[PDB]
Amino acid sequence: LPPKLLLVSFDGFRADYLKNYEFPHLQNFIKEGVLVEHVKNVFITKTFPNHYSIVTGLYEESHGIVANSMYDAVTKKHFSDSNDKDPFWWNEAVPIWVTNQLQENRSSAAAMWPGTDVPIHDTISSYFMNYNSSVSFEERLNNITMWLNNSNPPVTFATLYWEEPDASGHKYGPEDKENMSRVLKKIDDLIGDLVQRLKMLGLWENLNVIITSDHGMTQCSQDRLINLDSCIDHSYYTLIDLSPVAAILPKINRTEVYNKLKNCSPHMNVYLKEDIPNRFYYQHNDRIQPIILVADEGWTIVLNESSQKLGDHGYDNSLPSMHPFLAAHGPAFHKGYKHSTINIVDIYPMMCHILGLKPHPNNGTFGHTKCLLVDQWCI
Ligand SMILES: *[C@@H]1O[C@H](CO)[C@@H](O[C@@H]2O[C@H](CO)[C@@H](O)[C@H](O)[C@H]2NC(C)=O)[C@H](O)[C@H]1NC(C)=O
Ligand SMILES: *[C@@H]1O[C@H](CO)[C@@H](O)[C@H](O)[C@H]1NC(C)=O
Ligand SMILES: *[C@@H]1O[C@H](CO)[C@@H](O)[C@H](O)[C@H]1NC(C)=O
Ligand SMILES: [Zn+2]
Ligand SMILES: [Zn+2]
Numbered sequence: 001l002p003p004k005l006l007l008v009s010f011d012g013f014r015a016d017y018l019k020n021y022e023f024p025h026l027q028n029f030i031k032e033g034v035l036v037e038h039v040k041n042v043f044i045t046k047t048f049p050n051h052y053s054i055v056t057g058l059y060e061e062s063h064g065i066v067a068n069s070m071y072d073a074v075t076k077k078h079f080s081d082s083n084d085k086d087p088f089w090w091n092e093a094v095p096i097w098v099t100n101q102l103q104e105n106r107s108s109a110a111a112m113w114p115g116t117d118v119p120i121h122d123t124i125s126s127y128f129m130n131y132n133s134s135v136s137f138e139e140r141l142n143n144i145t146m147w148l149n150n151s152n153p154p155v156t157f158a159t160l161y162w163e164e165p166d167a168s169g170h171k172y173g174p175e176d177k178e179n180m181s182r183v184l185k186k187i188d189d190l191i192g193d194l195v196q197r198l199k200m201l202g203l204w205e206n207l208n209v210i211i212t213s214d215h216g217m218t219q220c221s222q223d224r225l226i227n228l229d230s231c232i233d234h235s236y237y238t239l240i241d242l243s244p245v246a247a248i249l250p251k252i253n254r255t256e257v258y259n260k261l262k263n264c265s266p267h268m269n270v271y272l273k274e275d276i277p278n279r280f281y282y283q284h285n286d287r288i289q290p291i292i293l294v295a296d297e298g299w300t301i302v303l304n305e306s307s308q309k310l311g312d313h314g315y316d317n318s319l320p321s322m323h324p325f326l327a328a329h330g331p332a333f334h335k336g337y338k339h340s341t342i343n344i345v346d347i348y349p350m351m352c353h354i355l356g357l358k359p360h361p362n363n364g365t366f367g368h369t370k371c372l373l374v375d376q377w378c379i
Helices: 024-031 047-056 096-101 137-149 166-172 177-200 254-261 344-355 366-372
Strands: 005-010 034-040 070-072 077-079 107-111 155-162 208-212 225-227 237-241 245-250 268-272 291-295 300-302 326-329 337-343
Touching: 005 047, 005 137, 005 177, 005 344, 024 177, 024 208, 024 326, 034 344, 047 096, 047 344, 070 237, 070 245, 096 107, 096 155, 096 344, 107 137, 137 155, 137 177, 155 177, 155 344, 166 177, 177 208, 208 344, 245 254, 254 268, 254 291, 291 300, 337 344, 337 366, 344 366
Parallel strands: 005 155, 005 208, 034 337, 107 155, 225 300
Antiparallel strands: 034 326, 070 077, 208 326, 237 245, 245 291, 268 291
């Protein structure tokens, strides 16, 4: 019987939510398993780029999903979260569900995880759901766990995705404790539903489960706005992505666009593509535009009519507010161990190890995850 792994993401689960709200079900999951208190994720700290990093072990410049909205000038193709089904956009890397699927006598399964409804290098998971945000968590849970438990050839890798607490974190902002506590209580209940379901099917003792997320959330404010329309005319550039990392494609002399934008607000950094800080690993890809604007934490780049959004993410990946957490339980994981931090790109080599897959070249460090694993030396 080959090892099995369920990877679960609750979108937008800021690491310090664990310290500020009560998660009885998640804490029960943790006490018989492992917790990484905060994971250093990848810039830019958006949903599609970070989910792909988890399943590839790659920085965004390397796997090619550099934002939730992209434009490739050469092919003229556009990407958005809904318009995300052209394999072109995913083919710069090979995600773990593909490597798993290519093994004889093994299958992959998916319930709503970004990209899992797209054939990547001509490979699609045996079981997958076409993205549909209306599908309940119960349906996602029941189908994913039934697939893991039944199925032949056996399902050895599975993904499970949920849109909260990201959606409501944007709505209320993470500083709204009254409303966020209700949001997060529901997430904790869903975690309880996951555990109860695993136990009922007798998967709980033998399935490896990772519960994690893609990024956190920080508070935005009408006192912290940078209006591009106040700084530069529309006719000078095309806006590929807006806030808090604006992707700017100049229509005229780049130097002219740069000179206006660099004198717009002290609350953002304005970079020529070739000046983007090395620490971001966000330069070496044609999908990165000639100029990017990076707003300081809690600042929002707007146009004249841009809607209010009390919470946001996308900021510098060194900010604690942007970091998710990771927890895990199962035969491969220690019981009751807690660790400060790992990098989000380390999850991939760890998962390949648990599953006995050959990892593709990546940016992760397996060593960072050894203390989580029963078969490994913990220095
Ligand atoms: C992250 O890992 C990737 C994968 O090995 C590295 O990308 C490779 O880099 C070399 C030279 O830069 C190329 O020959 C390969 O074709 C690249 N592969 C891919 C998939 O891009 C990348 O350099 C690593 N990043 C860092 C910062 O170390
Ligand atoms: C999305 O899911 C809901 C719930 O299953 C369903 O009623 C609806 O028809 C789905 N939409 C599409 C376009 O499949
Ligand atoms: C959930 O499983 C049922 C039963 O196998 C299936 O008919 C249904 O389409 C699944 N829901 C999806 C794929 O969203
Ligand atoms: Zn997200
Ligand atoms: Zn979001």
